[PDB]
């Protein structure tokens, strides 16, 4: 009832390891925790033979692209959830820091093995002659210019998108298309474990950002203005038009028979609109987002 | 390029060794909320002298003197190392350490423990103790590769390796011959297994160091690690005096700690070509080597009877 006349923030450092002050820290290092897998549990054989004997030029190609597009993010070091105790100082936001790190690690090495065994390292290698490619690398930049940002202000817009873009929705469309090969095909059910697995952990990324993002609106309202809102809806928007194009990468050699193009735009849309409202930003795209509904159950039955 | 240059691309390994210890810790993966010490709050309730109460809750609170807190060492080797594999390597052993504070801050909790935690710094063994752990960890966050590789090996071949051990030996000892203490034996247990592996992976990045910049590893430095480790001993040796306050107890002996302190200390530095120190008798190491025995056995449907 009783507010106080001061307080200590977010960004200030608390030494004291217990009780902490953003306990709800803790439901995510669980989901995390709860969470636990490594792809080493996993054979892909079935799903090379699968790959060799029963999918299309056009299907393989999605599965290829598919792959690339995700270990373009994945397979990579990605230094940004380990670094969030220099920006908020607290003992639990350390332990959400290094818990989400260290899973960025194992999703690392898991999508490093998928390269591996369908034999796209070289195509890896080489991604970025591919033009849709530089230009997400473009927007991914553009994303992460102030993570490593003094400026309180630039870090939180750092953030926002961070968690909105690449956690919530970059790779989702890459997970729907190969989740989509196991539930209307029966084929690549280990690929789609991984997959499932990496979308859990990737939900819980973007909710956990979320979190943090509203710890920052409810201490600093004033940050949350208009011309910072002016960057994010210019840069989210853009970003999709680049997520777009990413769908007419991956479907190259053609459409296939099970996922089509315009209902993973209307997906991402939809993501992206659900993710604003959980921060009070108003909606973008205002969206079929029916189409991809399955995409939550499917996730469930192929994370076992 | 060497150990201290980053690298881009991610694969192939530069140092594929690192997966041999992010393995060994996702094989080992393990959290405290798995175990439940009701059965333990009866055995130190109904079961334990005051002496025995005295050297579980000081063994305790000087475990927890080194967990819980923020660990920030492991998280940031990559700044020191840029390779993807040092990341994966600091990140996996960083969010190690929160399951270890997580659990030892179970522990306080659990057994009551919190205002004396809050109030340790007043033990002056406990001051000195942090006077030499700062010491290790002064040039953790050095730009000066030959400053910053001495804090590790300190902090692989001490912190990591020997500076919590006699407590988990402590700790272990009452399981091992009185049966008693047995979740809390297995929370040990587990943090032994993890804490080795962090000092070996330590140990490993040393040795490649020593291999890419031999002239690092100068008369000056050995000289510093050897002086500190034994300062250090001191320090540990009377920590015991500490925990036992309140009378010897009959499950384990500070001397036979303090041997085992110093085999080990011996152990690490042979593996990173140091001159031992103590060169302890095989009849003296051997008393506690039943050690590593006791960790194995702590560190592992329903069955009944109708009639
Ligand atoms: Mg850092
Ligand atoms: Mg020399
Ligand atoms: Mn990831
Ligand atoms: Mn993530
Ligand atoms: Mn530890
Ligand atoms: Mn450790």
Redesign the pocket.
Known sequence: LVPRGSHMSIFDKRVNYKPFEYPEVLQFTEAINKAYWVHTEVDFTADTQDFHAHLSLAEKTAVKNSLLAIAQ??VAV?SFWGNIYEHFPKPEFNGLGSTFAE??FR??EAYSRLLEVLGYNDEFEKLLDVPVIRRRVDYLSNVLKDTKSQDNRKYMVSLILFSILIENVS?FSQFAILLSFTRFKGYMKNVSNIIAW?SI??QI?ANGGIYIINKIREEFPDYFDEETLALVRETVKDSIAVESDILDWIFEEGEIESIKKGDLVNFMKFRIDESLKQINIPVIFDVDYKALAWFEEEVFANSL
Request: hydrophobic content about 15%; proline content about 0%.
């Open positions: 993010i994945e990605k899973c960025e999703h690392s790779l990496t952990d990737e990324h």
